[PDB]
Amino acid sequence: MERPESELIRQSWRVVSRSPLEHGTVLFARLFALEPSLLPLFQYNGRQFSSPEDSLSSPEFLDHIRKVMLVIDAAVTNVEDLSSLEEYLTSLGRKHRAVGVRLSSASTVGESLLYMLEKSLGPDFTPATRTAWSRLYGAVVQAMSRGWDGE
Ligand code: HEM
């Protein structure tokens, strides 16, 4: 990533990273509002969530959110050279395959991330901040898709 984009990403992540579950909760609430057909993909204790709010009562799901936020934090930490996370991210792509999940829904998850950032940052969500994040998310997804497919 470019050296100005890198700083915008670090500075913007700071407030989010202080309360990662509260913020991931926004991300996932937004996700299920946009695309409730993703809700059945998250199954714990042999059961489907009926409503999006049901997910937010599941300690397994909230623990899932914490994992997501930890991986985003890792991409932020390595933003100036994401090749250091390449092999992890390819492994993450394989995992999405292993559980029977394809990644054509990646753009919606991305929009959900950007939504959470916009709401957290308010006026500090500049256009430059948005494009930095979209570029980081894209690079993450492209590494994940390598692992999902051959390689
Ligand atoms: C592309 C659309 C996506 C869908 C539909 C999706 C869905 C899922 C599902 C269903 C699981 C399994 C949950 C479980 O049984 O506990 C999972 C795991 C995971 N997802 Fe995603 N996901 C997507 C993209 C992403 C992206 C872009 C990230 C980036 C941080 C991410 C991070 C994770 C992590 C960290 C796990 C847990 C990995 C592990 O336990 O080893 N996902 N995802």
Author numbering: 1 to 151
Structure paper excerpt:
Notably, hexacoordination in Ngb accounts for a peculiar structural rearrangement and complex kinetics upon ligand binding, which takes place when the distal histidine (His(E7)64), engaged in internal iron hexacoordination, dissociates from the heme. The dissociation of His64 is the rate-limiting step for ligand binding and it triggers a repositioning of the heme which slides further inside a large internal cavity. In this study, we spectroscopically and structurally characterized three Ngb mutants aiming at pinpointing key features: a CD loop mutant with enhanced flexibility (Gly-loop), the F106A mutant and the double Gly-loop/F106A mutant.
Crystal structures of unliganded hexacoordinated F106A (1.8 Å) and carbomonoxy-F106A (F106A-CO, 1.75 Å), were determined to observe the effect of removal of the steric barrier to heme sliding posed by Phe106. At this resolution, we clearly detect the double heme conformation: the B conformer (canonical, 30% in ferric F106A, 27% in F106A-CO) and the A one (reversed, 70% in ferric F106A, 73% in F106A-CO). However, the most striking observation about heme conformations is the relative position of the A and B conformers, that are laterally and vertically shifted, with their iron atoms being about 1.0 Å and 0.90 Å apart, respectively in the unliganded and in the carbomonoxy form. In addition, the Fe-Fe distance between hexacoordinated F106A and F106A-CO shows, upon CO binding, a displacement of the heme A conformer of about 2.3 Å and of 2.9 Å for the heme B conformer, larger than the one observed for WT Ngb (2.0 Å15). The enhanced displacement of B conformer is due to the absence of Phe106 ring onto which the heme leans in the WT protein. In the F106A-CO structure, the absence of Phe in position 106, associated with the two heme insertion modes, induces residues such as Trp148 and the whole FG loop to explore multiple conformations upon heme sliding. This structural feature could account for the biphasic behaviour detected in CO binding. The evaluation of the fast and slow binding phases in CO mixing experiment allows us to attribute to the B conformer the slow binding fraction and to the A conformer the fast binding one. The effect of the double heme insertion observed in Ngb is enhanced by the increased size of the large Ngb internal cavity created by the F106A mutation, which results in a set of alternate conformations of proximal side residues that account for the enhanced biphasic behaviour in ligand binding of mutants carrying this substitution.
